[PDB]
Amino acid sequence: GMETLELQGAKLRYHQVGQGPVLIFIPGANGTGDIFLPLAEQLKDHFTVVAVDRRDYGESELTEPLPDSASNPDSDYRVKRDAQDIAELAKSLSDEPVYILGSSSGSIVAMHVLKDYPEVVKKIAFHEPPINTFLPDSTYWKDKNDDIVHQILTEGLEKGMKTFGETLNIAPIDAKMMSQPADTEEGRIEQYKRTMFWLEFEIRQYTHSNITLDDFTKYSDKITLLNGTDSRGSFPQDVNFYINKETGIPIVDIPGGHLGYIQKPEGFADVLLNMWG
Amino acid sequence: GMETLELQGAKLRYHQVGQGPVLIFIPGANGTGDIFLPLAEQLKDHFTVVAVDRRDYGESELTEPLPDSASNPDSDYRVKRDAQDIAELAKSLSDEPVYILGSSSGSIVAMHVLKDYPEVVKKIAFHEPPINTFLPDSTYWKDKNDDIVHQILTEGLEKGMKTFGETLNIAPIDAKMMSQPADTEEGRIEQYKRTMFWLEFEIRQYTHSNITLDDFTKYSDKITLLNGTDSRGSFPQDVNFYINKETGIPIVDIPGGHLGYIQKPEGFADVLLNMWG
Numbered sequence: 001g002m003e004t005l006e007l008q009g010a011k012l013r014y015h016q017v018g019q020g021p022v023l024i025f026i027p028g029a030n031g032t033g034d035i036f037l038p039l040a041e042q043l044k045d046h047f048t049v050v051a052v053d054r055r056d057y058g059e060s061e062l063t064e065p066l067p068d069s070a071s072n073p074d075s076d077y078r079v080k081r082d083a084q085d086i087a088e089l090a091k092s093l094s095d096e097p098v099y100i101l102g103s104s105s106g107s108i109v110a111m112h113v114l115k116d117y118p119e120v121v122k123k124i125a126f127h128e129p130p131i132n133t134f135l136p137d138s139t140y141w142k143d144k145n146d147d148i149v150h151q152i153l154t155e156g157l158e159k160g161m162k163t164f165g166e167t168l169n170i171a172p173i174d175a176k177m178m179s180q181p182a183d184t185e186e187g188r189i190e191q192y193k194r195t196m197f198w199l200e201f202e203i204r205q206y207t208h209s210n211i212t213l214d215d216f217t218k219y220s221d222k223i224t225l226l227n228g229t230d231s232r233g234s235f236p237q238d239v240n241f242y243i244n245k246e247t248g249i250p251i252v253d254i255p256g257g258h259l260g261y262i263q264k265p266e267g268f269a270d271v272l273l274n275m276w277g
Numbered sequence: 278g279m280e281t282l283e284l285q286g287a288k289l290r291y292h293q294v295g296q297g298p299v300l301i302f303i304p305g306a307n308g309t310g311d312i313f314l315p316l317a318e319q320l321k322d323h324f325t326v327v328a329v330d331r332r333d334y335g336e337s338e339l340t341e342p343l344p345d346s347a348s349n350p351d352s353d354y355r356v357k358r359d360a361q362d363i364a365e366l367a368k369s370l371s372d373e374p375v376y377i378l379g380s381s382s383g384s385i386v387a388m389h390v391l392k393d394y395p396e397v398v399k400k401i402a403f404h405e406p407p408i409n410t411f412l413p414d415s416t417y418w419k420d421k422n423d424d425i426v427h428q429i430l431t432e433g434l435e436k437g438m439k440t441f442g443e444t445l446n447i448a449p450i451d452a453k454m455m456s457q458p459a460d461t462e463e464g465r466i467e468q469y470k471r472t473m474f475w476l477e478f479e480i481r482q483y484t485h486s487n488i489t490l491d492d493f494t495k496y497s498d499k500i501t502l503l504n505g506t507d508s509r510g511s512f513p514q515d516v517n518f519y520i521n522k523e524t525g526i527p528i529v530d531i532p533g534g535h536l537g538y539i540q541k542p543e544g545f546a547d548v549l550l551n552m553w554g
C-alpha cells in the first residue's frame with residue numbers, strides 16, 4: 001500500500017520506490033503521484049523516488065475541512081500548505097536536503113518549497129510551470145484564468161438553475177426568491193457551496209428515490225397534500241394531483257407559493273391550525 | 278442559539294420554539310430550518326415547533342465523511358439517513374407520535390419517514406414534492422434532472438477546458454490525455470469532481486501566487502527549468518523562457534509534452550539522470 005505521513009490537518013499518502021537519495025515528484029492538476037510511477041521505475045536504481053498525492057487529492061485525506069477563505073481567488077492557504085507538506089516529507093525521509101521535481105501546478109508548489117524551506121532543497125526542477133505573477137503580461141493570463149473559472153463555475157450554475165426553474169414551471173416569485181444572492185458575503189460563498197452540494201448529492205437521488213403509491217395508501221389517513229395558492233401550474237403541484245388521483249388523499253390549498261411558509265407565514269399558519277390545531 | 282441531537286455520523290442542529298405537541302418542519306433545497314422561523318412565530322402558542330438543519334447543511338455537522346458512493350445519482354444513503362434523523366429527533370422530543378411537515382425535497386424526506394418509521398408520525402403533510410419516481414412520465418422528468426446536473430457538473434468544464442487549452446496553446450496530445458474520460462461511470466464522476474475542485478481552489482490561487490524572479494536568483498545554482506520537446510509553442514514554455522531570459526537559469530529540454538514524464542518515461546528519466554545522477 002501507499003505510505004503515510006500524518007501532518008497537521010491531513011494524512012499525506014505517497015508512493016515510495018527505490019534506494020538512494022530522496023527524489024520527490026509533485027503532481028500538477030491530476031493531484032496524484034501515480035502519474036510518476038512509470039518514471040519512478042526508470043530511476044529506482046539511483047534515487048529513493050517519492051511520488052506524492054497532494055493532500056486534497058487521491059488517497060490523501062484531510063482530517064479537517066478546508067478553511068472558508070480557501071475559496072478566495074487570492075488565498076495562499078493551499079499552496080503554502082502543500083509546500084510545507086513537501087518540506088515535512090523531505091525531513092521525515094532524509095537527514096540531507098533532497099531532490100525535488102514538480103510539473104505544472106506542482107512546479108508552483110516546488111517554487112514555494114524553495115522560497116520558504118530552502119534548507120530542504122538540494123536541487124530542484126520546474127517542469128512547465130503555468131505561474132504568471134512575474135510575467136510582463138501577467139494581467140492577460142490572470143484575466144484568462146479568472147474568466148474561465150467564472151464561466152465554468154458561476155455562469156454554468158446560473159444558467160443551469162434558470163433552466164431548472166423553467167423545466168419545472170416554477171412561478172416567477174418563487175424562482176426570484178430561490179435565486180436571490182445572500183445579504184452577507186459569508187453567506188454568498190456558503191450559498192454556492194450549498195447549491196452545488198444539493199445539485200450533486202440531493203436532487204437526482206431524492207427526486208428518483210424509492211417511494212411507491214402503495215407507500216401512501218398504507219397510512220393514507222395520516223397524510224395531507226399541500227399546494228400553494230400562488231404556485232399553480234408548477235411541476236410539484238402536478239405531483240400532488242397525481243398522488244390524489246391514484247390514492248384519494250386530499251389536497252389542501254395553502255397561501256403562498258413554493259416557499260409559502262416564509263412568503264405568507266400568517267396565512268400558512270392559519271391553514272395548518274385548521275388542519276391540526 | 279440552536280439545539281443539538283448527536284446521532285450516528287452527525288450532530289443534528291435544530292431550532293425549537295413554542296409549547297404544545299411537537300411539530301417538525303423539514304426544509305427543502307436550502308437545507309436549513311431558519312426558513313421556517315417566521316412561521317414558527319405564528320404557531321408557538323399551539324405547537325412545540327422544531328425546525329431542522331438537515332445533517333449536511335447549516336449548523337449541523339457531519340462527524341464522519343459521506344460514503345464514497347453518495348455522489349452516485351442512484352444512491353439512497355442520504356435520503357434514508359435524513360429520514361432516520363427525523364425519526365430519532367421525534368423520539369428524543371416526544372413520547373407520542375408527532376406532526377411533521379416537509380416541503381420540496383424535505384417533503385421527500387417526510388415520505389421516507391412515513392415509509393420507514395410510521396410509528397413516529399401522528400399526521401404528516403407533503404408540501405409541493407418534486408419526486409417523480411412513481412409518475413407515469415417519470416422518464417421525462419428523471420432524464421431532465423440528470424441532464425441539467427450533467428450540464429453544470431461536467432459539460433461546462435468540458436467546453437471551457439477545450440477553449441482554455443487553445444488559449445494556452447496546449448499540444449493536442451496533452452489536451453487529449455488530460456481530457457481522456459475514465460473507463461467507468463464512477464471514475465468519470467471522480468475525474469470531473471477533481472477538475473471542478475482544481476478550478477475553484479487551485480488554478481487562480483497558484484498561478485497568481487507570490488513568487489518573484491528574486492526568489493529564483495537567490496538559489497539559482499539549485500534550479501533547472503524543464504521544457505518538453507513535444508509541447509513547443511505552449512504557454513508554460515514561455516514562462517520558462519522568461520525566467521531564463523531574466524535570470525540565466527538554464528533550460529533543459531526533456532522528452533514528451535506537458536505530460537512527458539508518463540508519455541516517455543525512459544527518455545524523461547535519462548535526462549534527469551544526466552542532470553542529477
Ligand SMILES: *[P@@](=O)(CCCCCCCCCCOC(=O)NCCC#C)OCC
Nearest residue numbers: 157158161164165178179305306381382
Ligand atoms: P426544493 O427542494 C426545489 C429546489 C429547486 C428545484 C428546481 C427549481 C429551480 C429553482 C430555480 C433556480 O433558482 C435557484 O434556485 N437559485 C440558483 C441561482 C444561481 C446561481 O426546495 C425549495 C426550497
Ligand SMILES: *[P@@](=O)(CCCCCCCCCCOC(=O)NCCC#C)OCC
Nearest residue numbers: 028029104105434435438439442455456
Ligand atoms: P497543470 O497544473 C495544467 C496547467 C493548465 C493546463 C490547461 C489544461 C487544458 C485543458 C485540458 C484538461 O482537460 C480537462 O482537465 N478536462 C476535460 C475537459 C475538456 C475538453 O497540470 C498538468 C498535470
Ligand SMILES: [Mg+2]
Nearest residue numbers: 135137140515
Ligand atoms: Mg506573452
Ligand SMILES: [Mg+2]
Nearest residue numbers: 270271273274
Ligand atoms: Mg382556524
Ligand SMILES: [Mg+2]
Nearest residue numbers: 427431432435
Ligand atoms: Mg457527458
